[PDB]
């Protein structure tokens, strides 16, 4: 088996429908609690802001089908097969097994894309829709949450994901973060309209932000082996240099949050201890007592953990990436221009020795106001 | 299992040596014939240009060890273990199996890096050398043949590859192609000095360029399933649309050169037939007979096959990538801004219907002029 075809772009065939009103269609890979992380969770929150009184609503599942357990967090929605065509106000349709099957697409069906392959499909549905109903192309809403070609080496998927940004028909970009919008602007992408939303502190975490802290000798690592953008292996190699080169490294505890993984030997009997996904209560507790953080994001997006860590009194090691430099956002953030295990280890020694106030990101504490503005354009 | 280390950056330990003169040390992944294409082949050709009368020469194999047959094109070099320290004028040392072992590194050993991990090792050796011998850092010569972070998704390997360009010690960059140089300059990378060499037609192909041409209805495809940058699966998907959409597709032969693969069914009983690696002679004969070419390169680098095809009278489909647009170089080249299977297929239809002489890249048919200037500088 050599790579022949591209699974992300399996045709997404439609048939016509009699359904009359405006209907917003959110294309998401999955709604499984299993996959209820970052992007999908944000898209759903955003989709929830659209006025139900003004738009019917359908969620189309592109990659995975839910459990009965999964559907419990969508009780108000009707679960409906694609062979069916029913005028429900709220519905969910599984469509990850698409071969020789179609989904009903109405004249005024409007599409909201998330993952690049969902936008890839939406842009082909819109053309089919235009030809079929004899109408000008409807606007697509594209919730852009990272430069998704960066999830791939230069390859077919890289250029197909980038192709979604070069689409010339009507398309509203909504960016996760201003920095990401600006990265897109600098590369010269054009959209009919552009919007962004900024990172906002978790509401549970904010309630702990003013608690008295009793700082301990803890280095807190954002550890996600499965998300390569988080540079897990680079952090681990940096920790090994730190442990060997710093003679006081035995005084320190090194802890991982994010993704549960096996504890890793770092030298001198010291381990990176994985806690994984904590409740927000427990995470807040760990942040209050932690003194140094490491959180890398190979992307123009700031990522959330460095922002959380900085507001809880941690000196936080993170990375510059092109237009992104978080060192200007908050006095607790240390940004590395040259990212190798040696510089990370050196910086960690200086920070450990520092253990022995200024914020320019007031937006982060105290959101989708532009949704009404978008409602009127769709 | 999870990765805990980064294999590309395994320590590359040195020990001192008494050897006296200047010595040029080519760091290459391997010299095996199976890998004697692309970058490594070009690095050896450049290395060959340096004066044997002025420099001792050593080749250091960082990834793979030669078979007896592989050393037959290196009869003038002595093959020596890293445990030995001999003052030969010409030698090859294997150093891919590194653990608990050292390579001898003399005071005036100068390093020539190729793959990014070889530059990453060189930059550490140089610092070690500077401290051990009490000398200012020696210049590294860096043969940069592509933007190598682009061989990875955003990841640890991505940033480590990029860190080789951000190194602040003395470093001369030698770029494969002016386009690649411009790409680097546009991203703001700094080096002590910058040189580049331009694409030159293979001399054996050149011998067939003046021959009579009997053009057939053949579409020629550069098929490299293993080289993601060549977007094989994209081409296959565009070919399947072409076959289905173009009612005259049954008139055309579609042939693949580059890497051997199974013949792929495209529809209508038409196959993409794989010829794989051909002698230069057979390739020339095919080029003289083919009328349309497809060769993709997801990289600022031009790649060679588009240029080869365009000089043999083929109408060539290729891609733009940032500062690269090959349609300005030669009238036979069509460059696609929007790269999807549909646009490729549509272009192929236009070129087929075209079946029913202007070059701005003269350098190509008329290379290391800077070697002397570098020699004086090292």
Author numbering:
A (entry chain A), B (entry chain B): 26 to 381, 389 to 398, 402 to 413
Paste lines from the article.
The crystal structure of WsaF was determined using single-wavelength anomalous diffraction of selenomethionine (SeMet)-labeled WsaF crystals at 2.28 Å resolution. The N-terminal domain comprises residues F26-F222, and the C-terminal domain is formed from residues T228-N381. The two domains are connected by the loop Q223-N227. The C-terminal α-helix S390-L413 crosses between the two domains and forms part of the N-terminal domain. The N-terminal domain has an eight-stranded β-sheet that is bounded by six α-helices. The C-terminal domain has a seven-stranded β-sheet that is flanked by five α-helices. Three regions of the structure have poor or no electron density, indicating conformational flexibility: the N-terminal M1-N25, the loop between β1 and α1 in the N-terminus (Q58-G63), and the loop that connects the C-terminal α-helix to the rest of the protein (N382-E389). In the crystal, two WsaF monomers form a dimer related by 2-fold symmetry. The dimer buries 1900 Å2 of solvent-accessible surface per monomer, and the statistical score provided by PISA indicates a dimer, which is also stable in solution. The conformation of K302 is disordered in the native structure.
